[PDB]
């Protein structure tokens, strides 16, 4: 039987990978980091409260100008916020109200969203007509589209619930690159700062590092015990952190190809919806199901602070590109800005 | 106050956007959200044409009441990752064929379509997001089941069934077996209706169940529930 021989070879390869990971690990991040000063207590106050959504807010994204926001809720409305003045720049009515992701273009020209309609809809913000119209609708996913991220005005990577990540060409609307290999539904997505690689967290308790220009998985990261719902690169692009339903955040390194540190507490038992990093990467912000965001010392696994003030589950997180503020969205139809 | 002309005009635009958002929310608050569920293509389509590829939107108005019925068919993924989106629906319309008690699902060996429907109903009814959400259970294809129960007994489906091979007793037994999967009888209600291929009164049953749910929500708002 060739199938049993190939299963034995796959088991041998997995054991070789595990042995190479074990032999390459000598001193953990705790053992080197325990000799530096902690960050103390990180206290943040709600500076703005963005009201106007009427259903559970499922996603958000910050602008690269660190002032403009976009948020998605089950109202069927994509509201673009001026976070400095608490002003609604745009309100985009959606064809499908079951939106679970939204992205904002780095140029600021476009907004994507997607959800249970299996379609990433690109919206042209800066039109000659003065309204926000659909640029195009990207179809081809057979499952719910769980995350989308703009590379530029013409390239976008969309995570989806068909156990498949996909890279699209917005000029043609065609499936440029298909990323396959995940067993469970892919729930999160995060682009590298140079947009050369990206990581995806799925429901197979695994994270995979893909290359955009070759379209095939480089490394696979395991260690979680439940469905990964959040993922985010470290700011230099050489590491990333995940968040799953087992109330643990794990930090993984691309070069070491290992898990470095678990950010978990005994008093936290609920799942993690959103994971975001600060500008320096020293603080890891994670949104949980117990209605608040916990700031973690990303180098020391210490609870640096708690961002409490949401009446329902914190579903989405976002730190501005200048690191000035963190914005938490939640199922109680509110967005809050913190400093 | 300490605002420019463009700042004041942007604030005015934001207030207009807030006004349109409030009107849209008030329009959507009077609509009835229904989640349509069932094990495969069993009776969803006949029910849909009786009132009227990702999620399917079905819009119909009955007695000056607008209904939003969502079909999550062909969403072949983990249900728990998107079933919390329908936490605030008015009721769940669960469609079950009565004639597939002896048919096989053909996806798994020795798998019954009826038992797959029981397992899906057990997962949906006792879900954490549907603790207080009522279920309008529809038992599809009663005439086909009535004419085929003479040829094939129900004991091949339920080994512990010892009643007569009649339509009424076995149909009541199937309804009781589906209602026994509700472990939250003190906080939710299951409405069961038997529907034929061409049955006119299906909408009225949905309207009555939705009206009971709306009465319960109204008493919840006034503190009587």
């Amino acid at each position, epitope marked *: 039987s060739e199938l049993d021989q190939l299963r034995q070879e796959a088991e041998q390869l997995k054991n070789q990978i595990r042995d190479a990971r074990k032999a390459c690990a000598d001193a953990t991040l705790s053992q080197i980091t325990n000799n530096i000063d902690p960050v103390g207590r990180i206290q943040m106050r709600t500076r703005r409260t963005l009201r106007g959504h009427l259903a559970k807010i499922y996603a958000m994204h910050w602008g690269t100008d660190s002032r403009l926001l976009v948020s998605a809720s089950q109202d069927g409305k994509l509201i673009i916020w001026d976070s400095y*003045t608490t002003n609604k720049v745009h309100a985009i009515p959606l064809r499908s109200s079951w939106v679970m992701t939204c992205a904002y273009a780095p140029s600021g020209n476009y907004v994507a969203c997607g959800g249970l309609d299996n379609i990433c809809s690109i919206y042209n913000l*800066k039109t000659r007509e*003065g*309204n926000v119209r659909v640029s195009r609708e990207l179809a081809g996913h057979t499952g719910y589209l769980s995350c989308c991220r703009f590379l530029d005005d013409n390239q976008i990577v969309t995570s989806s619930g068909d156990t498949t990540c996909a890279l699209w060409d917005i000029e043609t609307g065609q499936q440029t690159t298909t990323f396959t290999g995940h067993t469970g539904d892919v729930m999160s997505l995060s682009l590298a700062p140079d947009t050369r690689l990206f990581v995806s967290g799925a429901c197979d308790a695994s994270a995979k590092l893909w290359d955009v220009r070759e379209g095939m998985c480089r490394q696979t990261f395991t260690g979680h015990e439940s469905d990964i719902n959040a993922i985010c690169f470290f700011p230099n692009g050489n590491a990333f952190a995940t968040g799953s339903d087992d109330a643990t955040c794990r930090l993984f390194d691309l070069r070491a190809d290992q898990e470095l540190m678990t950010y978990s507490h005994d008093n936290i038992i609920c799942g993690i919806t959103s994971v975001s990093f600060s500008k320096s990467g020293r603080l890891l912000l994670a949104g949980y199901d117990d209605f608040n965001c916990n700031v973690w010392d990303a180098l020391k696994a210490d609870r640096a602070g708690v961002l409490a003030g949401h009446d329902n589950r914190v579903s989405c997180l976002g730190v501005t590109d200048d690191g000035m503020a963190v914005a938490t969205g939640s199922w109680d139809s509110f967005l809050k800005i913190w400093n | 106050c300490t605002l420019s002309a*463009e700042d004041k*005009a*942007a604030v*005015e635009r934001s207030k207009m956007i807030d006004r349109n958002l409030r009107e849209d929310g008030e329009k959507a608050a009077r609509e009835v959200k229904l989640l349509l569920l069932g094990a495969g293509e069993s009776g969803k389509n006949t029910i849909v044409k009786q009132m009227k590829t990702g999620i399917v939107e079905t819009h119909f108005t009955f007695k000056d009441l607008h209904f939003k019925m969502f079909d999550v068919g062909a969403q072949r993924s983990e249900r728990k990752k998107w079933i919390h989106c329908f936490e605030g629906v008015t009721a769940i319309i669960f469609c079950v064929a009565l004639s597939d008690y002896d048919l096989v699902l053909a996806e798994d060996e020795e798998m019954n379509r009826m038992h797959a429907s029981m397992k899906l109903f057990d997962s949906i009814c006792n879900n954490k997001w549907f603790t207080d959400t009522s279920i309008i259970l529809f038992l599809n294809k009663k005439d086909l089941f009535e004419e085929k129960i003479k040829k094939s007994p129900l004991t091949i489906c339920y080994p512990e069934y010892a009643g007569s091979n009649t339509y009424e007793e076995a149909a009541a037994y199937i309804q009781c077996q589906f209602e026994d999967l509700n472990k939250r009888k003190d906080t939710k209600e299951i409405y069961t209706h038997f529907t034929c291929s061409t049955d006119t009164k299906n909408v009225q049953f949905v309207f009555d169940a939705v009206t009971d749910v709306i009465i319960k929500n109204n008493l919840k708002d006034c503190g009587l529930f």
Partner: single-chain antibody
Amino acid sequence: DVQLVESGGGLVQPGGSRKLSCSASGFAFSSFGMHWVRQAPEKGLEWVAYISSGSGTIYYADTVKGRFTISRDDPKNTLFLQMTSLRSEDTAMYYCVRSIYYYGSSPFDFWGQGTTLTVSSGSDIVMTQATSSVPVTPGESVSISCRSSKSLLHSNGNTYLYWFLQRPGQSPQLLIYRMSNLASGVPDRFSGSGSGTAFTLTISRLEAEDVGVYYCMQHLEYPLTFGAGTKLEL
């Protein structure tokens, strides 16, 4: 495409009443604030009236306040200017101006073609342009300077200076909308700068397409005041 067409102009006796209509096509008329800007035969742009989106905020120039009436009807995409008691100084070519206001928006971007109307026989931010007519050789850089009595830099960091180019026999178009922000459809050789009350507009590698009259306008506080107008010849 976006178009604003004016109608209703003509020869009217002094003291009469005429109504100007502005039919809008190619854009969402309801979401745009709308302005009336007139140009007298002495070649000077003057703001007249402004109506916001939804008609919630209405402003008038101090010379036409209580004498003119601006209105819009968003179902038929028409902007109106009901004018009563017309005087001899109301003889001007009225332009219907399109403007939207959000963060990063570009108001005054599109202007209508303009209708010609003929009448027979203190606290405003005064803006002055030192050069009214200078010759320029094509292919060489030129700078147009503008000054304001009040500082146009607001506390939010925006300097509300607007640069307009009006070619001969053509409607004005927007080049710079907040003191540096290059507009859409205008080439990259137009660049604006300045700070406070001193301003300049640099046109490197000038061509015959850039020949016209340049106006600087503030949008800090109503009424909106235009510059005298700098014409580039040769």
